[PDB]
A and B are shown apart, each in its own frame.
Chain A
């Protein structure tokens, strides 16, 4: 039932400053009712959680997504002598699967880390602590972590997506080389193994075309670009 809160463009990721306007502070939080001052330490605890997790999460997500995306794209575009369609589709799929892996990877570590940061901030500023105020503290840090996890994740997901594209480009350099080499010897690239299999074993109705991929068959890959997990889908503005 719940849609994502942000669009891809709603969050600028060039700097950790992009996080501040979106941070949400439930005014009913008991710890906040008692010391409205502690609201001041939230932004920095969040920014430091993101700062410590962004690069491991980005690195791991791209690494998981890379192999899967390279193999499938290589497979789907095997009889496609052009490098243009392949590059775009690989772009869309890689960016999408990376964002998904990023979302799966950082959520629970973000919760833990944001909660930990807030408590320690809370416990240092005010001041001193108390058996009924540490309960407000841990209530506050847990709920705030929950309330800000989507924003923190989105930040990290977007960082991963921006980096993913050029990594896929580098990974597919030889594929682009195969198609470029062939054109210079005056011919279309066609994977010989795939050409044979498709011609001999695949039913006509579902065969990869030597003669090209019907624009309708590309619906999957367009959808990867349209609908990225953790963000509002794209439209015709």
Chain B
């Protein structure tokens, strides 16, 4: 029980700003070897409040964008701990009820292309990513009332390949939900905005391959074609690169994405 007692002490040391930075670092490294880290973080005194403190204390560095590497590394250790809480079966719902993702949206809204901001955004996306991996309808319903779709769309267009991939995966999970599909297809303005962005991404991928990103883009289109109205608009505006052999070569390994692309085409008849 020697290494586990080492964990309890860092957790206690998160409360005080003097020992917190160090405890952030050490705990963020152990989160794949401590399965019950999340409820311990959640259910201990002042811990979640300390992580929120870390988040809010870099708000002044967000606008104007003066965030440094060290600031970004520190807050991302905190975000890494919150991702752990977002993933766990025992803490997910309470995490959600406490509306903690909302204090991350100011990070997702940043547009600075420096590496401290890109890492900040990627790590924030990772928390939302952890949430939707669980496949809870409660998660999707929360995301739909909180307007994370425009945030994700801006990133899907302009982020690093990694950030674009996580952001598209989030959109994918929302779309896969019946309520999410209905929401995005509810008005032509909403559907058009999404289709427009997916269309831009397809163009960019034709110049710079990303298997992972292309896969999620294709899944989004495929899911969109489950909606009769979307199906009609897609017949008209589906990117030509998704019809010809532009991507044949990068796909010949990926049977799954090929199959999906195949059904997408078949659906549009």
B-contacting residues of A (Cβ < 8 Å)? 1-2, 4, 64, 67-68, 71-72, 75-76, 93, 96-97, 100-101, 103-104, 107-108, 197-198, 201-203, 205-206, 208, 213, 216-221, 223-224, 227, 229-230
Q: Which 3 A-B pairs have the closest CB atoms?
A: A205-B8, A220-B46, A219-B16
Contact of B46 among A202, A219, A230 (CB under 8 A): A219
Interface of A is mostly: helix
Interface centre among B4, B46, B49, B62, by most chain A C-beta atoms within 10 angstroms, is B49
Which residues of B are found within 8 Å of A2, using beta-carbon distances? 66
B45 adjacent to chain A (CB < 8 Å): yes
A-B contact pairs, 17 of them (CB 8 A): A68-B99, A71-B94, A71-B97, A76-B49, A96-B56, A103-B59, A201-B43, A203-B4, A203-B8, A203-B40, A205-B12, A206-B12, A208-B45, A217-B46, A218-B15, A219-B46, A223-B17
**A1 adjacent to B98 (CB under 8 Å):** no
Given the interface pairs A64-B102, A223-B53, A227-B57, the reply to whether A205 lies near B63 with Cβ below 8 Å is no
* Residue B52 at the chain A interface, CB threshold 8 Å: yes
Report which B residues bind A (CB closer than 8 A): 4-5, 8-9, 11-12, 15-17, 39-40, 43-46, 48-50, 52-53, 56-57, 59-60, 62-63, 66, 68, 94, 97-100, 102-103, 106
Contact A220 B50 (CB under 8 A): yes
Bound form: Cα–Cα A227–B58 in Å: 12
Which B residues are CB-close (under 8 A) to A93?
49
In the assembled complex, the Cα of A61 lies from the Cα of B123 at a distance in Å of 24
In the assembled complex, the Cα of A4 lies from the Cα of B15 at a distance in Å of 24
Q: Which residue of A lies closest to B8 (CB)?
A: A205
Output the least CB separation between B21 and chain A (Å). 13
Q: Cβ of A97 and Cβ of B56 under 8 Å apart?
A: yes
**Residues of A with C-beta under 8 A to B9:** 205
A68 touches B53 (CB 8 A): no
Number of A-B contacts (CB under 8 A): 102
Residues of chain B within 8 A (CB-CB) of A201 are 39, 43
Contact partner of A206 (CB less than 8 A), chosen from B44, B50, B99, is B44
By the criterion CB–CB under 8 Å, are B15 and A220 in contact? Answer: yes
Give every chain B residue within 8 A of A103 (Cβ-Cβ): 59-60
Minimum CB–CB distance for A98 against chain B, Å: 10
Contact of B17 among A108, A213, A219 (CB under 8 A): A219
CB pair A229 B48 closer than 8 Å: no
CB closest residue in chain A, given B61: A2
**Closest chain A residue, CB of each to CB of B62:** A104
Contact B98 A67 (CB under 8 A): yes
The verdict on A72 contacting B59 (CB below 8 Å), with A97-B103, A224-B53 known, is no
Residues of B contacting A104 in the complex (Cβ-Cβ under 8 angstroms): 59, 62-63, 106
In this complex, what residue of A is CB-closest to B63?
Answer: A107
Max chain A C-beta neighbours (<10 A), residue from B44, B62, B106: B44
A219 touches B15 (CB 8 A): yes
> Which residues of chain A come closer than 8 Å to B39, judged between CB atoms?
201
Report the minimal beta-carbon distance from A161 to chain B, rounded to whole angstroms: 13
Given contacts A201-B39, A202-B40, A229-B56, contact A68 B45 (CB under 8 A): no
A68-B100 contact in complex given A205-B5, A208-B45, A220-B46, C-beta closer than 8 Å: yes
Task: Report which of B44, B60, B66, B97 forms a contact with A4, defined as CB distance below 8 A.
Answer: B60
Q: Which one, B48, B63, B99, contacts A67 given CB within 8 A?
A: B99
A206 (CB) vs chain B CBs: closest residue: B44
Closest to A67 in B: B99
Is the beta-carbon distance between B98 and A71 smaller than 8 angstroms?
yes
Q: Which residues of A contact B48 (CB under 8 A)?
A: 72, 75
Which chain A residue lies CB-closest to B60?
A229
List of A residues within 8 angstroms of B4 by Cβ: 203
Residue in chain B with minimal CB distance to A2: B66
Interface centre among A76, A197, A208, A218 (most CB of B within 10 A): A76
CA distance A67 to B99 in the complex (A): 7
* Residues of chain B within 8 A of A208, CB atoms compared: 43-45
- Minimum CB–CB distance for B127 against chain A, Å: 14
Interface centre among B17, B57, B99 (most CB of A within 10 A): B99
